[PDB]
Amino acid sequence: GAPWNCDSCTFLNHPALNRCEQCEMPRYT
Amino acid sequence: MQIFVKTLTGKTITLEVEPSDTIENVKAKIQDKEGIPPDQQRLIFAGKQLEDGRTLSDYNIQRESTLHLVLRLRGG
Amino acid sequence: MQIFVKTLTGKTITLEVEPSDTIENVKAKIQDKEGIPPDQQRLIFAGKQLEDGRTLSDYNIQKESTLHLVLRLRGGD
Ligand SMILES: [Zn+2]
Numbered sequence: 001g002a003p004w005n006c007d008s009c010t011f012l013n014h015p016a017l018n019r020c021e022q023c024e025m026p027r028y029t
Numbered sequence: 030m031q032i033f034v035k036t037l038t039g040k041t042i043t044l045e046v047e048p049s050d051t052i053e054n055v056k057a058k059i060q061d062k063e064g065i066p067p068d069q070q071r072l073i074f075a076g077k078q079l080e081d082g083r084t085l086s087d088y089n090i091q092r093e094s095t096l097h098l099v100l101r102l103r104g105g
Numbered sequence: 106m107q108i109f110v111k112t113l114t115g116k117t118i119t120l121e122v123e124p125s126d127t128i129e130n131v132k133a134k135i136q137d138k139e140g141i142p143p144d145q146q147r148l149i150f151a152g153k154q155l156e157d158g159r160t161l162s163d164y165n166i167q168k169e170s171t172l173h174l175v176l177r178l179r180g181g182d
Contacts, residue, residue: 003152005076008037009097012076014149016175021152022073022099023037078151080165104169 030092032085034059034072037099048086052079059098071099108161109171110148112139117171125162128155135174147177154180 003012004027006020019026032055034042044058056067072079074088074096090096106124108131109117120134132143148155150164150172166172 009073009099010076011073011078011099012152014152014154014173014175016147016154016180017149017173021149021173022071022078076152104167 032090032093033095034098035095037097041095042098046085048084048090050085051081052083052085053081055079055085055096056081065098065100066103068103069100071101073097073099106161106168108166109169110135110139111171111173113141113174113176122161125160127157128159128161129157131155131161131172132157139174141174145177147175147180149173149175154182 001015003015005012006023006025008025009020009023011020011022013021030046032044032046034044042059042062044055046055046058052072053067055072056070059065059070060067074090074094077088079088106122108120108122110120111117118138120131120138122131122134132146135141135146136143150166150170153164155164
């Protein structure tokens with residue numbers, strides 16, 4: 001799917017990643 | 030102008046800045062408040078990691094914006 | 106120059122690369138060290154997939170940067 005913003009730090013992450021590249025938070029809760 | 034810097038632990042740092050301030054200048058202001066060396070700081074805004082060398086204006090960071098502070102191990 | 110790659114297992118490996126090494130050479134080093142064929146590698150840095158025909162400096166990858174390895178596809182060129 002689409003690049004996604006981390007809920008915590010806003011980093012715009014690649015859709016192939018399940019955790020934020022910057023702060024390691026999971027995409028969903 | 031004022032901007033805000035939010036830590037991952039949910040604290041908000043208030044900073045006095047100008048659009049012409051570099052990202053390094055902003056990190057120095059965060060060091061003044063938080064004791065964190067600039068080399069241990071990553072700033073994120075509107076999805077992007079802010080690069081040393083550029084200015085707030087380079088990223089269209091306006092008054093009252095919130096940046097996010099993410100810590101890193103100092104690069105060797 | 107040392108860079109880090111977060112591998113499929115969650116371990117991290119270190120690579121010794123040229124400061125402007127080609128992405129293809131980086132994938133070749135990952136194949137040798139981790140065993141993944143370059144065709145099956147997808148490398149992510151700063152939210153971006155790394156492309157063959159580019160170099161590390163095209164992505165502002167510097168010493169002790171961390172790349173993330175993911176299975177190709179389903180991106181996936
Ligand atoms: Zn994050």
